[PDB]
Amino acid sequence: GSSGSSGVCFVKALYDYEGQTDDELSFPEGAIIRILNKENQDDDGFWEGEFNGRIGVFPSVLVEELSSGPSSG
User: Fold this and answer.
1) In a 10 Å sphere around its CB, with 0-12 CB exposed, 13-18 middle and 19+ buried, how is residue 63 labelled?
2) How far apart are CA 63 and CA 67, in angstroms?
3) What is the number of other CB atoms lying within 10 angstroms of the CB of residue 37?
4) Rounded CA Rg of the chain
C-alpha cells in the first residue's frame, strides 16, 4: 500500500548547474530531470531527482516545470 502521490514530475534546467559536491546534481543548460522526491519544508528547499544515471539534489530554482499544454501567450 503506502499510496500517496502517484504522478512523477520532470523539469528542465534553465541554466547549467555545477553541483558543488557529489551529493548535488550537475546538468548542462537545458537538461531534463526526473523528480523522485518533493518533500522539502525545513531544509533549504532542494529536491531529489535522477539524471544520466546519477542521483543528487538541486535548488529546484535553476529548473522549469514541464506542463503538457501549450502556453497561451
Assistant:
1) buried
2) 13
3) 10
4) 13
Q: What is the dihedral of CA 22, 18, 16, 31, to 10 degrees?
A: -10
**C-alpha cell of residue 67:** 506542463
Is residue 40 within 8 Å of 46, Cβ to Cβ? yes
| CATH 3.40.30.20 describes domain 1-73 | no
How was this one solved? NMR
Dist CA 73 CA 70 (whole Å): 9
DSSP secondary structure of 2-20: -------EEEEESS-B--S
The domain ranges of the chain are: 1-73
- C-beta atoms surrounding 62 within 10 Å: 17
How far is residue 4's CA from residue 51's CA, in Å, rounded to a whole number?
24
